[PDB]
Amino acid sequence: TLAARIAISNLHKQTTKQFSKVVEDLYRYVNAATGKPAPMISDDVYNIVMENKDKLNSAIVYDRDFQYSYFGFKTLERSYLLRINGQVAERPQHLIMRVALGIHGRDIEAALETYNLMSLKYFTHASPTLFNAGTPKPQMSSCFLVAMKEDSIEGIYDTLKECALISKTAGGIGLHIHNIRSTGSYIAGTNGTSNGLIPMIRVFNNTARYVDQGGNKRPGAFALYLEPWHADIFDFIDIRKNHGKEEIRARDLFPALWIPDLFMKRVEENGTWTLFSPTSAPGLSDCYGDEFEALYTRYEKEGRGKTIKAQKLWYSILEAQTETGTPFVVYKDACNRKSNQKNLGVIKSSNLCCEIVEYSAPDETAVCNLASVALPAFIETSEDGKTSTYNFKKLHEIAKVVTRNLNRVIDRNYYPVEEARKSNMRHRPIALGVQGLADTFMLLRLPFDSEEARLLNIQIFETIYHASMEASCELAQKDGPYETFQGSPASQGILQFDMWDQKPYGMWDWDTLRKDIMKHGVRNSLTMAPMPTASTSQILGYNECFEPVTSNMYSFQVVNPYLLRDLVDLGIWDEGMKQYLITQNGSIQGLPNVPQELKDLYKTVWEISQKTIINMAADRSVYIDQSHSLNLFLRAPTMGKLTSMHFYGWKKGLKTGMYYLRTQ
Amino acid sequence: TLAARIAISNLHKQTTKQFSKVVEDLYRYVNAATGKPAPMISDDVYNIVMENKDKLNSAIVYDRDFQYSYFGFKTLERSYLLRINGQVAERPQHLIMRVALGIHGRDIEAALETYNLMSLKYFTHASPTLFNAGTPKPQMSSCFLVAMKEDSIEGIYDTLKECALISKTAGGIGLHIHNIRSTGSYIAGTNGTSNGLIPMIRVFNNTARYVDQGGNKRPGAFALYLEPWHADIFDFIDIRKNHGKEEIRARDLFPALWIPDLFMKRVEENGTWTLFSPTSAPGLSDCYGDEFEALYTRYEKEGRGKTIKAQKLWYSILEAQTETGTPFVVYKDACNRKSNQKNLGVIKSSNLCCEIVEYSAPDETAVCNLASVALPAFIETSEDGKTSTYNFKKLHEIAKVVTRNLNRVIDRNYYPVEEARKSNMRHRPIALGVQGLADTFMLLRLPFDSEEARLLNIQIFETIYHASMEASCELAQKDGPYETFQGSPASQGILQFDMWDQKPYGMWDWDTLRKDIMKHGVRNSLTMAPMPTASTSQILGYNECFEPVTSNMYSFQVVNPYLLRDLVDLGIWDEGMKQYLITQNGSIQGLPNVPQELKDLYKTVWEISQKTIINMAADRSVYIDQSHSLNLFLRAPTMGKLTSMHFYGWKKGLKTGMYYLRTQ
Ligand SMILES: Nc1nc2c(ncn2[C@H]2C[C@H](O)[C@@H](COP(=O)(O)OP(=O)(O)OP(=O)(O)O)O2)c(=O)[nH]1
Ligand SMILES: Nc1nc2c(ncn2[C@H]2C[C@H](O)[C@@H](COP(=O)(O)OP(=O)(O)OP(=O)(O)O)O2)c(=O)[nH]1
Ligand SMILES: Nc1ncnc2c1ncn2[C@@H]1O[C@H](COP(=O)(O)OP(=O)(O)O)[C@@H](O)[C@H]1O
Ligand SMILES: Nc1ncnc2c1ncn2[C@@H]1O[C@H](COP(=O)(O)OP(=O)(O)O)[C@@H](O)[C@H]1O
Ligand SMILES: [Mg+2]
Ligand SMILES: [Mg+2]
């Protein structure tokens, strides 16, 4: 609580103050053990700082280093602040300014604006952008979607190499493997027999452990995508199980289902499902919707696969999620039907955290650059105040700033492999998200499940999508649309919510925007993909992304600051209530002397109906370009509950039915 | 014993008889599950059989199918005889003829000669040649030596792919990794820190399990080579240990030491040894001898590494061999100093079984094609007889036949990767070996450790080397020397034994041969590499390669046929002696009523002095081009014993000090 203004003070004492000097130290750094010059700032950002040192040096407000809570600062200290000899060289303000310069280059005024907005916590960029912006090979991208190059040892190992090269410089990976022939399929060149996915997965698994994001940084992180008809599907979904048969597990990877509607239809009808090897039943990953169903159905009649009962696979899916939190679930038809990149071809996968939906192929590895807007920063106490209100106007303004940021990142990025550069330069996607929706709702006195919260959620996501497309239309006016604009839904005036066949809420003028996009283009094929903010939310001191809090009382013991305020304000906060909190896993329900309104406001995710989560996810989804990383939380899980959740999500038209399933 | 002329009879009944018809069945075969034409004979060998069916069909003697003992036939049945639908289609004679045609093509008379000699068991070819000769992509090579392409993720994964592609089509691999920076070395592109060899080994390990020699054929089989100065050396040697720390072991691979003399010198002097990362101490793998010692010594003074006591590494080497049989030991200086390929550059590794010594680099993967001569087939009962004698003249004749065979294999081979083709076409090495030396010695009434045996060993290897170079000089006269002949020791008249600074035994006219090689060249850079014959020896029914028997009584219980003969001939073979054999692990020493001469003749390897093995290995080594796969066998092992063995071998100038160390 106070140990923050204590440990930040210590860094100040143990660090150089003047920004242009820290930059000098970074830039002139030599790796001692090898005596090699190891500059930690690009030449270009170095020169820019030296030619602007007074302006740059004087713009920085180090008081702002005290915006960070204790965990936030320590998060910054451990992994983000550049170090010289195991000693931290950057103060948080310094990091921020390096990033704003990393992103903006010669445009100093744009860099100053980003410095102010980030230092004041209106928004942040994703971890890799913070780690690497303004450094010599700035790999600022968070996400890569990799296509298995070919069903051959040559393509498998070309793919493995690619993944290694990517993991080297710190992305997370989604990799689709639908085209690999299954167990027992014939191998012609040697008259042999395939052992299927598992032994191939195990090679990728080891690669992930080996290539730890730059040498002792973080284990490689790959999610694998598979359509539920693949004949190896039962072992794939179990890849994370704790119990026996070590040679058949792949514990360092994450399995994801790329589900066609037909699977769901068959599950609900209590029908049959057919398992195929892709050699016997080709092209299934390369179509979707009615076209997929006609193709699948024919192959199924032609006897080309093995028939089981659908509900047998399902029950196994459900078992695996209950035990491991995986596999993830992303609906292939929804993704494909409702994607502005549909003119590129069929989208075969999502990504490590199920927010990105972008087209990939053997020659194109889809990329995304991310940032998240801090939703609390736009609450103003009103002019009388106390009403508090929500400044949608400023939100719109900042989302436009961040849009332009993520666009510069595209052009200034170092891409690990050529397949990533080719994709990104062509198609130009970007990913805006949010953090602290829970905090916003709290501050404003709205319960998560309330109709008021429902409305705010809709308006926030409408404003972010509108702002991002407005900014992207602006950039297309200056710089031209992205190469692949023509033929896109957006070129026809079909925007995300149109694809859900809905009217927009209408807080913004979508018609003028649409008129404008049709005439001038947009600069980015996609703009929205709300992400977990698993790390960045913790730097800023807010609840991750768009989920309710999991607990009003984490563990160092820290009680929800909004709840604490309230308890003291009511003459009820004593030792007998702090007790009823570490024991109650952070709940206040049923608790004796506590007003109903606080109970309704400080509900945990474990106490909110997942029908409420799904509904709200489905509401904002009309304003999301890509998808979003929808964690599901079940207290006492049953197959019946799990089933109704997936199905409710599925019939709502979600793209990401489920990220992790969390239990207790 | 009789179950052989029973199970062979059954195959006959269950197989088609006429050779050209089995060929027809093979050639017209369709993979049923996929309906793809899967011809199991090349077009070229098919056409040859059809244009010569009477001659081919009538030359075959199916009585010869009864040359094979019971284990031999079953070995053939399980893995070698081509199958159509899980049913064996080839009789052994058929296999033999396919191979002779696979090797010889249009030269029918050469094919007939090879058919007679193989069917009559004068010699055989190595497993891959038997599996694949005359099939559509005939990969007949047994050995590949792979250079780690570069100290980078790009080169590591290009290497991994290469190994996969090779393993696909059934070779064994030696891979040298001396150039990979060790644990804690700096990584510049990302300001990180290396985790060294182990996590990289684990990726190769998984690849070996995955790529099982054509799809369900046999696990991948890789040996790794490392010079004992590499800073990761303590964990490398322990890679096969059974006990804890699973993440640090690599149990599906085999570690091999590539030892400079200096290591040994330092061990014996009780001196220091210095551990380096190759980034801090470059070029050590790229020189040998005095040049290596001056370079190593300087780096060691310049403080570039970590200093320990030599005997600490050694003791650990010795511990690991005691427990796992590994690491193998091959002396880098001996290999390099005494190699006809020395004009190519520094040889950085041996192979999976430590018999091959060939140059490899990022663009050249050394290859070898193998065959073994059955030493027993050249015993004739003499003209009066009973003396038995040894027909050195026929041995010479057959070795010349096999030389020409292995040369055609080179030209007719399908190479899995371009690096293997480039090497093999340039340099053209080949590998002759032997099987049943133990049987030969027995039949002839010579104890393994006798002076008579010593002499025969010297003469056999002299005759094989002479014959092989004679034949290879013949081919150079027709076809030109191999591309890289000029500048070689052999081009200067320096033959293997010259490099040991020895005179040849002189049973053959080496001077005329030398005159001839100097004028005309040889077709192959190398010709001799006696191999384990771990499988092929068992097909023919003889003791593997050049080792004494391990036991006069294996397990189906089978007693040494030469010993059995003797016991019945002496009125001593009863139930009380068969007993003293299953219990005595197959020994006859100390046994009451048994003549001294039989005790001396039927000594086990466990009862022969390893000084005798080393001596005899050192004797024949002067006639070996490459090296040979020298297993060592110790009853009750101690550090002192193990040490004197390695050192005695080392001072004898051996190339392969040790293959496996076997214990009990
Ligand atoms: N376990 C195992 N799997 C293999 C092996 N070789 C290939 N595979 C798998 C990898 C691919 O999914 C599939 C086909 O591999 P390739 O395309 O390299 O085989 P190839 O072109 O020789 O035969 P094809 O014409 O594709 O049937 O079989 C092997 O040696 N062991
Ligand atoms: N554990 C781990 N090892 C790595 C990683 N990246 C590279 N290595 C190892 C593999 C090589 O032995 C060595 C050098 O790798 P690279 O040549 O790909 O690194 P780079 O060229 O970026 O840096 P350099 O100039 O070579 O120091 O470090 C990593 O992300 N994790
Ligand atoms: N452990 C990880 N290693 C590498 N990349 C990751 C990891 N966790 C998340 N990512 C990448 O960052 C993206 C967004 O994740 P998020 O948790 O919002 O990241 P952060 O908050 O660290 O910026 C994911 O889609 C994924 O590609
Ligand atoms: N398990 C194996 N897998 C692949 N190759 C092997 C294996 N064992 C031996 N080899 C290859 O064959 C060579 C000679 O071995 P040997 O035991 O004489 O083979 P074989 O008797 O089967 O022909 C070795 O140097 C190695 O490269
Ligand atoms: Mg193929
Ligand atoms: Mg490098």
Side-chain angles (χ1 to χ4, degrees), chain A residues 1-4 7-70 72-73 75-385 387-518 520-664, chain B residues 1-4 7-70 72-73 75-385 387-518 520-664:
Chain A
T1 192
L2 83 100
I8 292 166
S9 181
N10 308 326
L11 187 79
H12 270 40
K13 299 189 181 193
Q14 277 177 306
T15 304
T16 299
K17 168 150 164 163
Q18 179 169 271
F19 171 72
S20 68
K21 175 66 191 150
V22 169
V23 167
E24 184 70 31
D25 288 333
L26 297 162
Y27 185 67
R28 298 286 172 203
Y29 178 66
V30 175
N31 175 255
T34 181
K36 239 172 173 199
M40 312 172 62
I41 304 284
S42 69
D43 282 347
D44 150 274
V45 171
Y46 174 76
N47 289 335
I48 285 149
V49 179
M50 298 298 131
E51 301 162 12
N52 293 93
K53 60 181 92 170
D54 291 341
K55 204 184 224 161
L56 265 15
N57 277 337
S58 75
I60 287 168
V61 183
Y62 297 111
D63 213 8
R64 293 172 174 174
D65 278 352
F66 296 95
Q67 291 266 346
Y68 303 102
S69 74
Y70 178 77
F73 171 78
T75 319
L76 282 189
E77 212 202 335
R78 161 110 189 108
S79 338
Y80 298 75
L81 299 179
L82 299 173
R83 300 183 170 237
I84 271 155
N85 276 295
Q87 197 140 71
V88 174
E90 286 185 320
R91 308 176 164 206
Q93 300 313 114
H94 289 149
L95 164 326
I96 296 169
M97 183 67 75
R98 163 177 61 82
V99 172
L101 262 6
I103 291 177
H104 293 292
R106 297 268 165 213
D107 188 353
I108 272 79
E109 304 299 293
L112 262 8
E113 176 188 50
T114 294
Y115 169 86
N116 299 329
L117 296 171
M118 287 173 67
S119 63
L120 292 166
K121 311 202 304 184
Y122 282 102
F123 75 79
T124 194
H125 282 260
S127 291
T129 300
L130 304 178
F131 301 146
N132 299 312
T135 66
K137 272 153 179 190
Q139 203 305 280
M140 296 167 275
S141 305
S142 281
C143 309
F144 301 83
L145 327 209
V146 179
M148 182 55 63
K149 292 177 180 295
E150 195 177 291
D151 187 30
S152 70
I153 296 289
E154 203 191 3
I156 293 171
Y157 278 81
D158 282 340
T159 301
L160 186 72
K161 180 195 182 185
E162 186 183 22
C163 288
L165 286 177
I166 280 156
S167 190
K168 179 181 165 3
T169 58
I173 277 162
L175 168 69
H176 55 271
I177 63 180
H178 319 296
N179 55 324
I180 296 310
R181 59 191 87 168
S182 50
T183 306
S185 302
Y186 178 60
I187 300 175
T190 59
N191 197 219
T193 264
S194 164
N195 284 138
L197 289 177
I198 305 303
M200 186 208 72
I201 295 324
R202 303 193 91 244
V203 173
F204 278 90
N205 189 89
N206 191 24
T207 286
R209 315 197 78 165
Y210 178 34
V211 192
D212 57 352
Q213 314 200 40
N216 269 112
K217 300 203 169 299
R218 260 191 315 187
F222 313 168
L224 311 171
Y225 283 81
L226 229 214
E227 296 194 33
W229 49 254
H230 195 282
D232 287 333
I233 186 63
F234 281 91
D235 295 335
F236 174 80
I237 60 174
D238 279 18
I239 221 109
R240 285 181 78 80
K241 275 177 171 185
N242 249 154
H243 44 87
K245 263 64 58 38
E246 163 168 54
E247 77 156 341
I248 217 81
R249 312 252 110 107
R251 297 187 168 116
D252 306 295
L253 308 171
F254 305 84
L257 295 182
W258 193 239
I259 310 182
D261 296 337
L262 224 194
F263 179 61
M264 298 293 283
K265 268 173 212 155
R266 297 291 184 83
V267 168
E268 95 176 302
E269 291 168 2
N270 188 61
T272 61
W273 185 238
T274 303
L275 302 184
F276 301 104
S277 179
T279 46
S280 300
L284 254 15
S285 69
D286 208 42
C287 56
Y288 64 92
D290 298 345
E291 188 177 356
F292 161 86
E293 298 188 2
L295 187 55
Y296 187 92
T297 287
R298 184 196 134 201
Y299 282 160
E300 190 172 27
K301 282 176 186 170
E302 289 170 3
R304 303 163 85 126
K306 177 171 164 163
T307 296
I308 194 34
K309 294 255 279 167
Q311 289 192 7
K312 194 205 165 195
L313 213 207
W314 187 254
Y315 234 89
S316 272
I317 312 288
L318 288 196
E319 184 158 337
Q321 302 166 332
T322 297
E323 273 179 51
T324 68
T326 69
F328 308 145
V329 179
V330 190
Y331 297 108
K332 151 193 182 214
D333 296 314
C335 285
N336 262 283
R337 210 193 317 118
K338 295 136 109 200
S339 176
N340 192 59
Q341 280 189 352
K342 61 168 64 179
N343 64 316
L344 300 181
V346 182
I347 294 162
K348 296 180 192 52
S349 90
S350 187
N351 73 301
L352 181 64
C353 303
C354 317
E355 76 277 38
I356 303 304
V357 7
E358 298 170 15
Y359 177 77
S360 56
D363 74 321
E364 282 186 23
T365 286
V367 195
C368 225
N369 291 285
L370 316 209
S372 70
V373 167
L375 296 180
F378 307 88
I379 295 157
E380 319 175 312
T381 281
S382 187
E383 221 58 82
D384 89 33
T387 224
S388 337
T389 52
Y390 200 78
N391 198 344
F392 300 100
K393 271 143 211 257
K394 258 274 177 165
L395 178 55
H396 199 274
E397 182 198 316
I398 279 33
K400 301 241 295 183
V401 164
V402 180
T403 303
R404 307 193 220 270
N405 284 10
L406 292 170
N407 257 283
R408 287 205 160 129
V409 180
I410 284 158
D411 291 312
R412 277 168 73 84
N413 210 66
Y414 198 77
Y415 298 100
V417 302
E418 162 62 26
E419 299 96 318
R421 196 210 47 86
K422 193 189 189 263
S423 175
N424 228 29
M425 297 322 257
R426 260 169 83 51
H427 302 309
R428 280 185 90 88
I430 249 85
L432 277 92
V434 299
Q435 52 166 280
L437 213 216
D439 316 60
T440 303
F441 282 166
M442 290 183 171
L443 272 338
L444 288 197
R445 298 262 134 205
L446 321 172
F448 207 102
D449 54 1
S450 77
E451 168 75 39
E452 283 76 49
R454 177 203 162 258
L455 233 167
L456 181 60
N457 183 70
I458 291 182
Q459 39 210 209
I460 284 177
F461 288 87
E462 191 195 16
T463 136
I464 303 178
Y465 184 42
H466 183 279
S468 63
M469 302 287 280
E470 198 180 85
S472 185
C473 181
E474 288 171 348
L475 298 161
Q477 289 172 239
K478 301 187 182 79
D479 296 326
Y482 64 93
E483 255 172 66
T484 217
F485 179 65
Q486 298 215 168
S488 65
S491 75
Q492 294 317 104
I494 302 180
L495 310 183
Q496 190 59 198
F497 48 86
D498 293 307
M499 279 169 149
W500 296 66
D501 297 285
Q502 286 179 34
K503 266 145 167 53
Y505 172 76
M507 168 174 303
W508 302 90
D509 179 10
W510 292 95
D511 300 334
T512 302
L513 186 50
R514 189 180 296 97
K515 157 175 94 98
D516 281 344
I517 295 171
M518 289 169 74
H520 296 116
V522 282
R523 192 69 182 137
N524 312 101
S525 39
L526 311 152
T527 58
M528 309 276 287
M531 64 283 108
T533 71
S535 279
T536 47
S537 73
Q538 152 173 163
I539 295 167
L540 302 192
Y542 303 116
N543 206 247
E544 34 273 311
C545 59
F546 39 69
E547 57 199 65
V549 308
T550 66
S551 174
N552 290 292
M553 214 254 92
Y554 302 98
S555 288
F556 254 95
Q557 134 261 326
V558 170
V559 26
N560 182 341
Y562 322 129
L563 170 74
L564 191 71
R565 163 87 308 202
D566 290 16
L567 298 186
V568 188
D569 285 21
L570 298 172
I572 59 189
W573 172 251
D574 54 355
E575 199 49 75
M577 284 197 67
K578 188 208 167 211
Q579 221 230 67
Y580 189 97
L581 225 52
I582 19 182
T583 314
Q584 314 319 319
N585 313 328
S587 184
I588 63 164
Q589 313 298 291
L591 212 170
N593 190 52
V594 160
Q596 191 48 29
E597 79 145 333
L598 300 210
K599 285 176 158 105
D600 281 6
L601 193 75
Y602 301 108
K603 273 169 179 178
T604 287
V605 72
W606 305 116
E607 296 156 346
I608 288 150
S609 83
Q610 301 302 104
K611 176 201 141 167
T612 284
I613 311 297
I614 300 327
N615 278 330
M616 293 168 75
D619 283 343
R620 60 175 86 96
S621 293
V622 315
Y623 300 118
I624 323 293
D625 262 348
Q626 312 212 39
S627 182
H628 55 119
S629 316
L630 225 233
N631 284 144
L632 255 26
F633 304 81
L634 257 216
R635 256 230 293 159
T638 72
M639 252 67 74
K641 275 288 209 156
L642 226 192
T643 296
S644 54
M645 292 185 279
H646 292 307
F647 270 87
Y648 188 70
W650 175 61
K651 291 153 180 298
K652 286 310 260 205
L654 301 195
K655 292 163 190 194
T656 301
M658 191 197 274
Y659 184 28
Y660 283 91
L661 183 266
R662 309 250 190 248
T663 273
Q664 250 126 136
Chain B
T1 192
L2 83 100
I8 292 166
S9 181
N10 308 326
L11 187 79
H12 270 40
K13 299 189 181 193
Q14 277 177 306
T15 304
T16 299
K17 168 150 164 163
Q18 179 169 271
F19 171 72
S20 68
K21 175 66 191 150
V22 169
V23 167
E24 184 70 31
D25 288 333
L26 297 162
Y27 185 67
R28 298 286 172 203
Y29 178 66
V30 175
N31 175 255
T34 181
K36 239 172 173 199
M40 312 172 62
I41 304 284
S42 69
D43 282 347
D44 150 274
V45 171
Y46 174 76
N47 289 335
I48 285 149
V49 179
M50 298 298 131
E51 301 162 12
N52 293 93
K53 60 181 92 170
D54 291 341
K55 204 184 224 161
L56 265 15
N57 277 337
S58 75
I60 287 168
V61 183
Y62 297 111
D63 213 8
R64 293 172 174 174
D65 278 352
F66 296 95
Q67 291 266 346
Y68 303 102
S69 74
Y70 178 77
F73 171 78
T75 319
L76 282 189
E77 212 202 335
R78 161 110 189 108
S79 338
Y80 298 75
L81 299 179
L82 299 173
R83 300 183 170 237
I84 271 155
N85 276 295
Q87 197 140 71
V88 174
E90 286 185 320
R91 308 176 164 206
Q93 300 313 114
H94 289 149
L95 164 326
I96 296 169
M97 183 67 75
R98 163 177 61 82
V99 172
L101 262 6
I103 291 177
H104 293 292
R106 297 268 165 213
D107 188 353
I108 272 79
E109 304 299 293
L112 262 8
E113 176 188 50
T114 294
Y115 169 86
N116 299 329
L117 296 171
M118 287 173 67
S119 63
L120 292 166
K121 311 202 304 184
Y122 282 102
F123 75 79
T124 194
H125 282 260
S127 291
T129 300
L130 304 178
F131 301 146
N132 299 312
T135 66
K137 272 153 179 190
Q139 203 305 280
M140 296 167 275
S141 305
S142 281
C143 309
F144 301 83
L145 327 209
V146 179
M148 182 55 63
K149 292 177 180 295
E150 195 177 291
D151 187 30
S152 70
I153 296 289
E154 203 191 3
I156 293 171
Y157 278 81
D158 282 340
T159 301
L160 186 72
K161 180 195 182 185
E162 186 183 22
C163 288
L165 286 177
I166 280 156
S167 190
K168 179 181 165 3
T169 58
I173 277 162
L175 168 69
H176 55 271
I177 63 180
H178 319 296
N179 55 324
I180 296 310
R181 59 191 87 168
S182 50
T183 306
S185 302
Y186 178 60
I187 300 175
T190 59
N191 197 219
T193 264
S194 164
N195 284 138
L197 289 177
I198 305 303
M200 186 208 72
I201 295 324
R202 303 193 91 244
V203 173
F204 278 90
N205 189 89
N206 191 24
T207 286
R209 315 197 78 165
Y210 178 34
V211 192
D212 57 352
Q213 314 200 40
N216 269 112
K217 300 203 169 299
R218 260 191 315 187
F222 313 168
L224 311 171
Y225 283 81
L226 229 214
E227 296 194 33
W229 49 254
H230 195 282
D232 287 333
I233 186 63
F234 281 91
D235 295 335
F236 174 80
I237 60 174
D238 279 18
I239 221 109
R240 285 181 78 80
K241 275 177 171 185
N242 249 154
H243 44 87
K245 263 64 58 38
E246 163 168 54
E247 77 156 341
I248 217 81
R249 312 252 110 107
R251 297 187 168 116
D252 306 295
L253 308 171
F254 305 84
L257 295 182
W258 193 239
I259 310 182
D261 296 337
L262 224 194
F263 179 61
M264 298 293 283
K265 268 173 212 155
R266 297 291 184 83
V267 168
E268 95 176 302
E269 291 168 2
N270 188 61
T272 61
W273 185 238
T274 303
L275 302 184
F276 301 104
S277 179
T279 46
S280 300
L284 254 15
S285 69
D286 208 42
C287 56
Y288 64 92
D290 298 345
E291 188 177 356
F292 161 86
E293 298 188 2
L295 187 55
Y296 187 92
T297 287
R298 184 196 134 201
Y299 282 160
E300 190 172 27
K301 282 176 186 170
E302 289 170 3
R304 303 163 85 126
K306 177 171 164 163
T307 296
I308 194 34
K309 294 255 279 167
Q311 289 192 7
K312 194 205 165 195
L313 213 207
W314 187 254
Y315 234 89
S316 272
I317 312 288
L318 288 196
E319 184 158 337
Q321 302 166 332
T322 297
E323 273 179 51
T324 68
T326 69
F328 308 145
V329 179
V330 190
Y331 297 108
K332 151 193 182 214
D333 296 314
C335 285
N336 262 283
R337 210 193 317 118
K338 295 136 109 200
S339 176
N340 192 59
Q341 280 189 352
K342 61 168 64 179
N343 64 316
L344 300 181
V346 182
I347 294 162
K348 296 180 192 52
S349 90
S350 187
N351 73 301
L352 181 64
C353 303
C354 317
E355 76 277 38
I356 303 304
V357 7
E358 298 170 15
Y359 177 77
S360 56
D363 74 321
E364 282 186 23
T365 286
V367 195
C368 225
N369 291 285
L370 316 209
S372 70
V373 167
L375 296 180
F378 307 88
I379 295 157
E380 319 175 312
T381 281
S382 187
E383 221 58 82
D384 89 33
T387 224
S388 337
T389 52
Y390 200 78
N391 198 344
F392 300 100
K393 271 143 211 257
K394 258 274 177 165
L395 178 55
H396 199 274
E397 182 198 316
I398 279 33
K400 301 241 295 183
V401 164
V402 180
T403 303
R404 307 193 220 270
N405 284 10
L406 292 170
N407 257 283
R408 287 205 160 129
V409 180
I410 284 158
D411 291 312
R412 277 168 73 84
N413 210 66
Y414 198 77
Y415 298 100
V417 302
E418 162 62 26
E419 299 96 318
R421 196 210 47 86
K422 193 189 189 263
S423 175
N424 228 29
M425 297 322 257
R426 260 169 83 51
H427 302 309
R428 280 185 90 88
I430 249 85
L432 277 92
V434 299
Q435 52 166 280
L437 213 216
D439 316 60
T440 303
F441 282 166
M442 290 183 171
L443 272 338
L444 288 197
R445 298 262 134 205
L446 321 172
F448 207 102
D449 54 1
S450 77
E451 168 75 39
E452 283 76 49
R454 177 203 162 258
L455 233 167
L456 181 60
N457 183 70
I458 291 182
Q459 39 210 209
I460 284 177
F461 288 87
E462 191 195 16
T463 136
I464 303 178
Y465 184 42
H466 183 279
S468 63
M469 302 287 280
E470 198 180 85
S472 185
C473 181
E474 288 171 348
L475 298 161
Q477 289 172 239
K478 301 187 182 79
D479 296 326
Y482 64 93
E483 255 172 66
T484 217
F485 179 65
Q486 298 215 168
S488 65
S491 75
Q492 294 317 104
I494 302 180
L495 310 183
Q496 190 59 198
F497 48 86
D498 293 307
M499 279 169 149
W500 296 66
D501 297 285
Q502 286 179 34
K503 266 145 167 53
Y505 172 76
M507 168 174 303
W508 302 90
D509 179 10
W510 292 95
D511 300 334
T512 302
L513 186 50
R514 189 180 296 97
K515 157 175 94 98
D516 281 344
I517 295 171
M518 289 169 74
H520 296 116
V522 282
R523 192 69 182 137
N524 312 101
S525 39
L526 311 152
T527 58
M528 309 276 287
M531 64 283 108
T533 71
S535 279
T536 47
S537 73
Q538 152 173 163
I539 295 167
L540 302 192
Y542 303 116
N543 206 247
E544 34 273 311
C545 59
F546 39 69
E547 57 199 65
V549 308
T550 66
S551 174
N552 290 292
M553 214 254 92
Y554 302 98
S555 288
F556 254 95
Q557 134 261 326
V558 170
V559 26
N560 182 341
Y562 322 129
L563 170 74
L564 191 71
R565 163 87 308 202
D566 290 16
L567 298 186
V568 188
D569 285 21
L570 298 172
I572 59 189
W573 172 251
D574 54 355
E575 199 49 75
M577 284 197 67
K578 188 208 167 211
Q579 221 230 67
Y580 189 97
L581 225 52
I582 19 182
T583 314
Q584 314 319 319
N585 313 328
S587 184
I588 63 164
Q589 313 298 291
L591 212 170
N593 190 52
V594 160
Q596 191 48 29
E597 79 145 333
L598 300 210
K599 285 176 158 105
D600 281 6
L601 193 75
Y602 301 108
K603 273 169 179 178
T604 287
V605 72
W606 305 116
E607 296 156 346
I608 288 150
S609 83
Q610 301 302 104
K611 176 201 141 167
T612 284
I613 311 297
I614 300 327
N615 278 330
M616 293 168 75
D619 283 343
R620 60 175 86 96
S621 293
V622 315
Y623 300 118
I624 323 293
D625 262 348
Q626 312 212 39
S627 182
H628 55 119
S629 316
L630 225 233
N631 284 144
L632 255 26
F633 304 81
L634 257 216
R635 256 230 293 159
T638 72
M639 252 67 74
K641 275 288 209 156
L642 226 192
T643 296
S644 54
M645 292 185 279
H646 292 307
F647 270 87
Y648 188 70
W650 175 61
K651 291 153 180 298
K652 286 310 260 205
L654 301 195
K655 292 163 190 194
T656 301
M658 191 197 274
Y659 184 28
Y660 283 91
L661 183 266
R662 309 250 190 248
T663 273
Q664 250 126 136

